[PDB]
Short mmCIF file of C-alpha atoms in Angstrom, two decimals:
data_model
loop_
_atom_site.label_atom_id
_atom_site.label_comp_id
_atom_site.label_asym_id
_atom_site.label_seq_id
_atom_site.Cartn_x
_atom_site.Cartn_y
_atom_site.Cartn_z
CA UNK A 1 0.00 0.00 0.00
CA UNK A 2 1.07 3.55 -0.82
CA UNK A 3 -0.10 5.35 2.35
CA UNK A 4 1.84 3.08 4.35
CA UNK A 5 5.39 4.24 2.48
CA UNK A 6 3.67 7.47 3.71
CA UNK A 7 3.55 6.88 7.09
CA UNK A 8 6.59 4.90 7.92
CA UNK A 9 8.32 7.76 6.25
CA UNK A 10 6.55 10.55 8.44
CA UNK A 11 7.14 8.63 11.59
CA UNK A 12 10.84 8.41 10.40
CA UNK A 13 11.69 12.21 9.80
CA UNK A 14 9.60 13.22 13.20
CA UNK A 15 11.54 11.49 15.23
CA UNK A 16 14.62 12.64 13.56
CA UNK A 17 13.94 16.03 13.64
CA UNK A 18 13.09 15.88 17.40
CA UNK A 19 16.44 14.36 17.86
CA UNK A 20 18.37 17.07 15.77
CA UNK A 21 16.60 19.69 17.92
CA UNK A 22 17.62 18.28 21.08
CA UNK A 23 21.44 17.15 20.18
CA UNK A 24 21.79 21.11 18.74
CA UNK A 25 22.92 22.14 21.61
CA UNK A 26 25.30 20.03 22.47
CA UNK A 27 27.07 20.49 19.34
CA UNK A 28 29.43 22.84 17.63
CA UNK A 29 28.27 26.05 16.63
CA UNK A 30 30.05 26.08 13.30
CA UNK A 31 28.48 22.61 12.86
CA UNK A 32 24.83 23.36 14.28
CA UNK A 33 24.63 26.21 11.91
CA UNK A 34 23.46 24.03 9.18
CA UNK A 35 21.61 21.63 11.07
CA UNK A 36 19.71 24.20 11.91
CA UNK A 37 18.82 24.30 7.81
CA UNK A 38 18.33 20.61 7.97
CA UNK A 39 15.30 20.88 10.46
CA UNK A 40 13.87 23.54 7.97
CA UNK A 41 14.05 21.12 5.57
CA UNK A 42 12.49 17.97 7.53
CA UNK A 43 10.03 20.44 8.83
CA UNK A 44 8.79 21.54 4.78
CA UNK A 45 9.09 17.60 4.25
CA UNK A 46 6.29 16.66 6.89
CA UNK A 47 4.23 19.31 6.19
CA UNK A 48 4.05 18.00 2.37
CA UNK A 49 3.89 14.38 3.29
CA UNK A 50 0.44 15.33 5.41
CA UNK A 51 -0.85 17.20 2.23
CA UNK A 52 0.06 14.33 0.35
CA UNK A 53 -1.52 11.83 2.64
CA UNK A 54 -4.68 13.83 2.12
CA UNK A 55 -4.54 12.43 -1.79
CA UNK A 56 -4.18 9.60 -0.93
CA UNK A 57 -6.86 9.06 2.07
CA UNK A 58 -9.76 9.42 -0.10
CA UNK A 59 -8.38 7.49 -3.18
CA UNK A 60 -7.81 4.34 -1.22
CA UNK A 61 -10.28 1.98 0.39
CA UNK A 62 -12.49 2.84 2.68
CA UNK A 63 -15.82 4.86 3.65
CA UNK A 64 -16.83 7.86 5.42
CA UNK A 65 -16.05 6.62 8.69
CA UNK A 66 -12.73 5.59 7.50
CA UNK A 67 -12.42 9.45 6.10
CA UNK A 68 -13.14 11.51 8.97
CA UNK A 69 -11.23 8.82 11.78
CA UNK A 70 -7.99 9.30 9.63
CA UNK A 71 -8.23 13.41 9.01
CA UNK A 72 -8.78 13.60 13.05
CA UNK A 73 -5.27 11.75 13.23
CA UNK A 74 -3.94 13.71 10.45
CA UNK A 75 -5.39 17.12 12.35
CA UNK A 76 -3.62 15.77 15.78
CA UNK A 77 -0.56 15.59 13.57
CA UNK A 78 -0.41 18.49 12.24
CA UNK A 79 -0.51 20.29 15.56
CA UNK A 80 2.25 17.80 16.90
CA UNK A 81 4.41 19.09 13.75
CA UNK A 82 3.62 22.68 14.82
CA UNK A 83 4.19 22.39 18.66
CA UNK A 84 7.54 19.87 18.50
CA UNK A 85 8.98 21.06 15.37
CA UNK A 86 8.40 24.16 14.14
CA UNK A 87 7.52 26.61 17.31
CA UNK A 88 11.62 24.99 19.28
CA UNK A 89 13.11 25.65 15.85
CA UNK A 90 12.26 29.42 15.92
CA UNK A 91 13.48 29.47 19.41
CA UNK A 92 16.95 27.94 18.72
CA UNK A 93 17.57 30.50 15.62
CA UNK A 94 16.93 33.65 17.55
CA UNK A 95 19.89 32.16 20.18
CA UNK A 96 23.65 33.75 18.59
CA UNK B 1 17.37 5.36 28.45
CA UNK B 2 17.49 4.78 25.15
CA UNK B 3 21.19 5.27 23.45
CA UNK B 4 22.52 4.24 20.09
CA UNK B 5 25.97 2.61 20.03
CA UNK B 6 28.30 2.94 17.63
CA UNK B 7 31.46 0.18 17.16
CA UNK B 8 33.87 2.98 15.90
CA UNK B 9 33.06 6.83 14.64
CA UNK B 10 35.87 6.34 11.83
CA UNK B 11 35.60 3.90 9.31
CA UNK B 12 38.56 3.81 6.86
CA UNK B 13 37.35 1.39 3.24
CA UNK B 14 39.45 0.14 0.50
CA UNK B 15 38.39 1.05 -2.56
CA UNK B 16 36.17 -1.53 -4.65
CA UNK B 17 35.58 -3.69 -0.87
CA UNK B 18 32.74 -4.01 0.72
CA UNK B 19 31.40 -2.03 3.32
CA UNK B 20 29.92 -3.30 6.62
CA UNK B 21 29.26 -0.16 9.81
CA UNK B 22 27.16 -1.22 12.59
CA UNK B 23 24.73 0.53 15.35
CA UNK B 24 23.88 -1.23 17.86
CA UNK B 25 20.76 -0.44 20.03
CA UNK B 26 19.80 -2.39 23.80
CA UNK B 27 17.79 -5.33 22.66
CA UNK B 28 15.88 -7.24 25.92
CA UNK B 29 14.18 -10.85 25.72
CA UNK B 30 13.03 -10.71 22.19
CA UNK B 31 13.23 -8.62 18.92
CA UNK B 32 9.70 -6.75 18.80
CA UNK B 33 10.15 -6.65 14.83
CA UNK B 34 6.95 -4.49 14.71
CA UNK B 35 8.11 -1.61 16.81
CA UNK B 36 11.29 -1.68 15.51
CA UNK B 37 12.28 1.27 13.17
CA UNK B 38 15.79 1.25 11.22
CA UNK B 39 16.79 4.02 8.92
CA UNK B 40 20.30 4.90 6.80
CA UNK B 41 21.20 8.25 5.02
CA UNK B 42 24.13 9.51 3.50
CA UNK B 43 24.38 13.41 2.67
CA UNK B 44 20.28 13.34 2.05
CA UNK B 45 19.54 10.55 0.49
CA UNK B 46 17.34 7.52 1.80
CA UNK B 47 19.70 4.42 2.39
CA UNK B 48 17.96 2.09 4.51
CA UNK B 49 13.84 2.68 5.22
CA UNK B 50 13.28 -0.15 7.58
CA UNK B 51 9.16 -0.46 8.80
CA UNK B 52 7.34 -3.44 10.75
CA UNK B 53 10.01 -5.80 9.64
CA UNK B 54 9.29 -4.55 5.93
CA UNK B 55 12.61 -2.67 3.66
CA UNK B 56 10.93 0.25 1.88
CA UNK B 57 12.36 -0.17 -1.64
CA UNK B 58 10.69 2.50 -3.58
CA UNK B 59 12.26 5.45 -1.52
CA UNK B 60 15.63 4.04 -1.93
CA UNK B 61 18.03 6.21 -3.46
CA UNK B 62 18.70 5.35 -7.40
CA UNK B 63 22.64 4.99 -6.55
CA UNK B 64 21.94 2.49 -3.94
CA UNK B 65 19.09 0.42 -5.97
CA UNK B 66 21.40 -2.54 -5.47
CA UNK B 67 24.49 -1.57 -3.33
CA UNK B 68 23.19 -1.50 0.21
CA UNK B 69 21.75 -3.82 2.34
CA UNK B 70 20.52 -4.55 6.22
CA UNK B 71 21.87 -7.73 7.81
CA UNK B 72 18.76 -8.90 9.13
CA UNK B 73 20.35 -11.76 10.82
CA UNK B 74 22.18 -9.18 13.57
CA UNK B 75 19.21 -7.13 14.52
CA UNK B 76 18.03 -9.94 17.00
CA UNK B 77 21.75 -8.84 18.31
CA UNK B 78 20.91 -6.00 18.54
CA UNK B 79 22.49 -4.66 16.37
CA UNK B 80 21.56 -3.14 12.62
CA UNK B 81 24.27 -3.47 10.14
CA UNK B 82 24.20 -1.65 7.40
CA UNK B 83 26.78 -3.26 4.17
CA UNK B 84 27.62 -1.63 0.56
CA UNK B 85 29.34 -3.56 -1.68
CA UNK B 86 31.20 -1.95 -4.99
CA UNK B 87 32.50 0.89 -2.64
CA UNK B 88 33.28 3.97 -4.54
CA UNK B 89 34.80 7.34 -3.54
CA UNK B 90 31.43 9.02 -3.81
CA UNK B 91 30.69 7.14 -0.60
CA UNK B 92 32.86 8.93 1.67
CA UNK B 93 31.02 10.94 3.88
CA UNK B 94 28.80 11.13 7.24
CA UNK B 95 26.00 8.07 7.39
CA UNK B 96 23.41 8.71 9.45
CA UNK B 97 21.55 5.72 11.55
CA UNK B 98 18.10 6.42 13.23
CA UNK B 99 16.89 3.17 15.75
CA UNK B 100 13.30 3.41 17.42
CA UNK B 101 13.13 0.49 19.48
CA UNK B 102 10.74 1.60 22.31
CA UNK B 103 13.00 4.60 22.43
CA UNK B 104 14.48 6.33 19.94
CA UNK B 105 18.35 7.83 18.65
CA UNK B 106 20.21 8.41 15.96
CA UNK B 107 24.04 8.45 15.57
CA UNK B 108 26.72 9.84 13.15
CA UNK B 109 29.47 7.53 11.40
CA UNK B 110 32.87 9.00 9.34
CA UNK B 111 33.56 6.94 6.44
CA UNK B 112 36.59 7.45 4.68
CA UNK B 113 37.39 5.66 1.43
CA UNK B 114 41.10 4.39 0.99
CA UNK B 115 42.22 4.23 -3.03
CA UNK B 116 45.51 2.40 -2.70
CA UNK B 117 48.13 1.91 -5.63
CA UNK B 118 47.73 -1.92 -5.25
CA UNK B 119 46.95 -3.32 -8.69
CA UNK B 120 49.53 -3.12 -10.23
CA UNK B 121 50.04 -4.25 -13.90
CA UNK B 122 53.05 -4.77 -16.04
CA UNK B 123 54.61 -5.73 -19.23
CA UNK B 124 57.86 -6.10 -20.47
CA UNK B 125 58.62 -5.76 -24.55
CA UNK B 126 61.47 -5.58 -26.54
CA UNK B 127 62.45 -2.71 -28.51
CA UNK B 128 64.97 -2.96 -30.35
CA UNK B 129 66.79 -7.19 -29.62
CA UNK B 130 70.19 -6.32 -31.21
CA UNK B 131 70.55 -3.75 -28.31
CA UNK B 132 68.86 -5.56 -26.05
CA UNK B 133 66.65 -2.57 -25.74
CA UNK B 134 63.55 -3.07 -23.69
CA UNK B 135 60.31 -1.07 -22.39
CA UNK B 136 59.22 -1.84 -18.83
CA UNK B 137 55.39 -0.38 -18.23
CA UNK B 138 53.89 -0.37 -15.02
CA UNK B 139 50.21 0.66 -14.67
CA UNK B 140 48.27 1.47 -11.61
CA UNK B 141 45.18 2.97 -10.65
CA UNK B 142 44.58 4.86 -7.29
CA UNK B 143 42.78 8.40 -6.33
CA UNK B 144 45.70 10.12 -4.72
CA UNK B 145 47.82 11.78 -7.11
CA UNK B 146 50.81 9.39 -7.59
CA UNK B 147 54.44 8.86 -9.07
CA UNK B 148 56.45 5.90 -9.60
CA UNK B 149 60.35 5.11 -8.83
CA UNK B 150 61.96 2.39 -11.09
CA UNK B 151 64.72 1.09 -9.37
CA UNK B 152 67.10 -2.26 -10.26
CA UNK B 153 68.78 -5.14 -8.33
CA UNK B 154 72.27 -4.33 -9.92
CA UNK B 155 71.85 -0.73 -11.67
CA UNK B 156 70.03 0.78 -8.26
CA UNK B 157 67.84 3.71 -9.13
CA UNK B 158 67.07 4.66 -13.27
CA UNK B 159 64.65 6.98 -14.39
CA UNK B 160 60.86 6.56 -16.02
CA UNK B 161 58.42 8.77 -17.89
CA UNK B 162 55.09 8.86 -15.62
CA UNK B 163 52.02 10.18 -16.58
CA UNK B 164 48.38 11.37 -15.15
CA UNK B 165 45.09 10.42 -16.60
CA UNK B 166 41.32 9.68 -16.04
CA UNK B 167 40.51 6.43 -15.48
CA UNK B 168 37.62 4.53 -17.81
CA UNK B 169 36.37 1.99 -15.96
CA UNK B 170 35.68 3.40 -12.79
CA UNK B 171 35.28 7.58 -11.34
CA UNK B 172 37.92 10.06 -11.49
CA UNK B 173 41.00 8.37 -9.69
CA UNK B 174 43.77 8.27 -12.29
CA UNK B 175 45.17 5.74 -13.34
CA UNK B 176 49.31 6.15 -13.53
CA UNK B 177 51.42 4.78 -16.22
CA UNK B 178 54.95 5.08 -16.23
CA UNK B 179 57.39 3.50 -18.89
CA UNK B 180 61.38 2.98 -18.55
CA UNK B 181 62.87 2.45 -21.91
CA UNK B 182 66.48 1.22 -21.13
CA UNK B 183 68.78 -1.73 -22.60
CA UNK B 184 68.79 -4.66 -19.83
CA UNK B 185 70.11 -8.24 -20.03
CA UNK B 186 68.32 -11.71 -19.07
CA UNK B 187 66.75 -12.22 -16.14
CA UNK B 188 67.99 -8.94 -14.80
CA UNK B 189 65.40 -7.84 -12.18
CA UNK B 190 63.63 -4.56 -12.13
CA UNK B 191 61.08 -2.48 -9.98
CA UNK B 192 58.55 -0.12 -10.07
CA UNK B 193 57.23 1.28 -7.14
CA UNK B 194 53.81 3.47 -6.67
CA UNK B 195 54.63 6.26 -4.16
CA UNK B 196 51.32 8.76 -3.71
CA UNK B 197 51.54 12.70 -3.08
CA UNK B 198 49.85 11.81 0.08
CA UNK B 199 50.27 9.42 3.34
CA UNK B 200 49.77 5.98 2.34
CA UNK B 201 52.37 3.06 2.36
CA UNK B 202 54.30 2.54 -1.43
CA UNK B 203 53.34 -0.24 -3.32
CA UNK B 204 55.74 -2.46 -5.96
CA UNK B 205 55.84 -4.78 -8.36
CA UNK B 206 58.91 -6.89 -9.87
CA UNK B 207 59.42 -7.37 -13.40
CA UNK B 208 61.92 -10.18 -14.70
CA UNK B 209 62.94 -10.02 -18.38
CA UNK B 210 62.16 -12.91 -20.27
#
């Protein structure tokens, strides 16, 4: 199934961006500068992988109650991007 | 806690070997293959996508369609392996390995890829047989930019032409080629040795005339 490549993958970079956020710190600053970057990039990926997942919800199997009990998970996600992602990136950019 | 362990930070390849680096993650009882979550990148691009026991094929990177692969044997050990075979300079670099086994980590491994002057191919032809005049050739291919010293049993050090090129079967290491066109006898024995601009141990071959 397609939406599963979807959501192993999302799983995947969420975790890793977590982790890049919280081993920033304890790295150098010449190297975190671009790791910083990185996390922008993760963060862009999720965002389009939940668009994507959209697609893909209503063109595979399934009914109405399938519909809405996915986009409630997909909603939930979304604000777990926004809370653990992108709100501590903005606060580790404005640091130096 | 949950911590990702890595066998060595530095991993220093011959060229055209195989490739084998290892992270290890705490394993207890059993391997829940379900929960567990492996993944591999090099410089941004998708390695090793590793789901409910299932390899993720179609995200693999076109330049590893059939070059890397996940010992599936060693992660009951505990321990995800991660092997490239046909290794190349391109692979030289930081690989990136992400474990989420209950917990969750992800580690950093140095790979450095060693090009050595170790094939070494030669020929020996004859020039000119009233004056026993013969070409030695020695041929090696190897990254590092390289010369080579021709030295004898009996006449000690001589003197070669050597030259730089691209190589065509394989990326841009050159491949070295240095000829010594002198007038030798039978069975006198000659040498050829592949010294690089850089670190590395020489390498030599003997040539006997025929």
């Amino acid at each position: 199934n397609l939406l599963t490549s979807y959501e192993g993958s999302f799983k995947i970079q969420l975790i890793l961006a977590k982790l890049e956020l919280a081993k920033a710190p304890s790295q150098p600053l010449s190297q975190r500068n671009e790791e910083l970057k990185r996390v922008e990039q993760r963060q862009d990926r999720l965002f389009d992988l939940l668009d994507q997942m959209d697609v893909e919800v209503n063109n595979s199997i399934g009914d109405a109650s399938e519909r809405a009990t996915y986009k409630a998970k997909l909603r939930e996600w979304k604000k777990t991007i926004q809370s653990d992602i992108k709100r501590p990136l903005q606060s580790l950019v404005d640091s130096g | 806690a949950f911590t990702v362990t890595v066998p060595k930070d530095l991993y220093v390849v011959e060229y055209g070997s195989n490739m084998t680096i290892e992270c290890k993650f705490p394993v207890e009882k059993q391997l829940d293959l379900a929960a567990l979550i492996v993944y591999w990148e090099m410089e941004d691009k998708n390695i090793i996508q590793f789901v409910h026991g299932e390899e993720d094929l179609k995200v693999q990177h076109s330049s590893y369609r059939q070059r890397a692969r996940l010992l599936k044997d060693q992660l009951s050990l505990g321990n995800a392996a991660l092997q490239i075979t046909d290794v190349k300079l391109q692979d030289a670099g930081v690989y990136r390995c992400m474990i989420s086994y209950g917990g969750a980590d992800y580690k950093r491994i140095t790979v450095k890829v060693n090009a050595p002057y170790n094939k070494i191919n030669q020929r020996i032809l004859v020039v000119d047989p009233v004056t026993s005049e013969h070409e030695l050739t020695c041929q090696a291919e190897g990254y590092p930019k390289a010369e080579v010293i021709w030295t004898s049993s009996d006449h000690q050090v001589l003197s070669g032409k050597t030259t730089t090129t691209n190589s065509k079967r394989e990326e841009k290491l050159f491949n070295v080629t240095s000829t010594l066109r002198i007038n030798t006898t039978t069975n006198e024995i000659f040498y050829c040795t592949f010294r690089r601009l850089d670190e590395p141990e020489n390498h030599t071959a003997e040539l006997v005339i025929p």
